[PDB]
């Protein structure tokens, strides 16, 4: 497995993704072809490990949702 650091420039618009899982793990389920997530390297199946340094490895689904949206955003993901 591989780990990558993704960077999405916060623009007050749709980040361009959808996530599933939590309490095991938050995985990206959809990536808009025209969205920010697709333009910045995100892919379906990636596990979100950290949101701007906050560890979301074992975060609840809503814990991850707040981290993602609560106010450039850095996502560290695991990818196989």
């Amino acid at each position: 497995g591989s780990v990558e650091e993704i960077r999405l420039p916060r623009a007050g618009g749709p980040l361009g993704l959808s996530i599933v899982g939590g309490s095991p793990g938050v995985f990206i389920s959809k990536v808009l072809p025209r969205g920010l997530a697709a333009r910045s390297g995100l892919r379906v199946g990636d596990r979100i490990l950290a949101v701007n340094g906050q560890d979301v490895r074992d975060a609840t689904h809503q814990e991850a949702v707040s981290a993602l949206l609560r106010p450039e955003l850095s996502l560290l993901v695991r990818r196989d």
Binding site: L15, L17, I19, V20, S29, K30, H61, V65, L69
Partner: peptide, 7 residues
């Protein structure tokens, strides 16, 4: 059970 959150 399952949630999909569009952000």
């Amino acid at each position: 059970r399952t949630i999909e959150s569009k952000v």
